[PDB]
Amino acid sequence: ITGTSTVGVGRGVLGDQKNINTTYSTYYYLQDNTRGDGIFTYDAKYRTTLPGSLWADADNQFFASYDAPAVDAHYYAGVTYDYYKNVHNRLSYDGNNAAIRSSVHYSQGYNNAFWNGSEMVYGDGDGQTFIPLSGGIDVVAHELTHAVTDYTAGLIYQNESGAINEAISDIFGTLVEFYANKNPDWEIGEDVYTPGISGDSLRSMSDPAKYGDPDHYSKRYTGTQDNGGVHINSGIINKAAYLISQGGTHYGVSVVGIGRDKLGKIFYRALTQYLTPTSNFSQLRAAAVQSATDLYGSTSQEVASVKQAFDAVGVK
Ligand SMILES: [Ca+2]
Ligand SMILES: [Ca+2]
Ligand SMILES: [Ca+2]
Ligand SMILES: [Ca+2]
Ligand SMILES: [Zn+2]
User: Fold this and answer.
1) Which partner from 59, 104, 188, 284 sits 20 to 30 angstroms from 306, CA to CA?
2) Is 143 tagged catalytic?
3) Residue whose C-alpha is closest to residue 30's, from 18, 38, 45, 40
4) Do 289 and 300 form a contact (C-beta atoms < 8 A)?
5) Which residues take part in binding Ca(2+) 3?
6) Is position 219 within any domain?
7) Among candidates 289, 314, 288, which has minimal Cα distance to 233?
8) Are 113 and 143 in contact (CB under 8 A)?
9) CA separation (Å) from 123 to 70, 102, 104, 107, 133?
10) Domain end: 154, 187, 210, which one?
11) Annotated binding-site residue? 94
12) Is residue 178 domain-shared with residue 305, that is, in the same domain?
């Protein structure tokens, strides 16, 4: 919509108050003109027709409980935009400042969030397994990272390339959580998962096996469920990324940690310069080794740690 850029205030899903970039034209709309070609948040109104209506508010105040999921979808899209821009010099998900669009209140009791090829979509959860999914910065950045992958490597969402596509999203969702720096960790979705149970999440990168996911190639899932295990086998790659960053000894193989910033640089370069639609795990290892070599040199600690981390998870 055409109007002036304004600044609203509201509360997110977890009750935290934040400022949001809005646009004024009769109503105040959730349209942030300060990043690229805009961030636009829409109301799906408990339906599944997308995108729904661009979110309109009479007073630029967003404190109703109905407002909260939209507050977070809009705000965390902006944090994720800033991360790619400031850290990777990437402008929006296509690298050319594509508008970021998100719809909230999708369906009823919908326990999921996803990138549908054109936009973000967040369920409200059923109140038991999940609260509104946009309350988790790692969920928002995970799903927006699928948009980044779709425009770069284009890793096919099936078998090994699919599990890489999933892992990349867990990695950058986690790195966005650390960048924003509010209670960061190596688990996925903890802020919105199971309001009755402390300390759980959907997945762990530091210990994938905590939730039944393989942490070594010898344990890969080889069946047909979950598109050949894209959410299951990502654990192998998540554990390798965790080891590259943090270090540790995993099945007797020691890895020297190089930190989050270098992990992010190595995997961003692999993503955008080396991976292709059909890349398998062993090709990811080569891309990550070539990436670390370009960035740090072939004799570097960085290259050696990458090689160690993939050895530790059984990937040659
Ligand atoms: Ca209002
Ligand atoms: Ca956290
Ligand atoms: Ca997390
Ligand atoms: Ca919980
Ligand atoms: Zn995903």
Assistant:
1) 188
2) yes
3) 40
4) no
5) 177, 183, 185, 190
6) yes
7) 314
8) yes
9) 11, 11, 6, 7, 6
10) 154
11) no
12) yes
User: Is residue 187 a known part of a binding site?
Assistant: yes
Of all helices (H) and strands (E), which one includes residue 308? Answer: helix 301-312
Q: Which two tokens stand for residue 25?
A: 């034209």
Method used experimentally:
X-ray
Total domain count, the chain: 2
In a domain, 1, yes or no: no
Q: Is 151 annotated as a binding residue?
A: no
User: Which protein residues have their CB within 5 A of the ion that is ligand 3?
Assistant: 138, 177, 185, 187
- Distance (angstroms) between ligand 3 centre and the Cα of 205 equals 9
57 is in an annotated binding site: yes
Q: CATH number of the domain at 204, please.
A: 1.10.390.10
Q: Is 250 designated active site?
A: no
- For this entry, resolution in Å reads 2.2
The token duo for 303 is 């290259």
Centre of ligand 2 to C-alpha 86, Å, is 21
- State the distance from the centre of ligand 2 to the C-alpha of 165, rounded, in angstroms: 21
Residue type, 188: I
In the block, tokens 């284009």 appear at 154
Ligand nearest to the CA of 125: 4
Task: For residue 309, report the distance from its CA to the centre of ligand 2, in Å.
Answer: 24
Question: Which of 143, 160, 250, 302 does the annotation list as catalytic?
Answer: 143
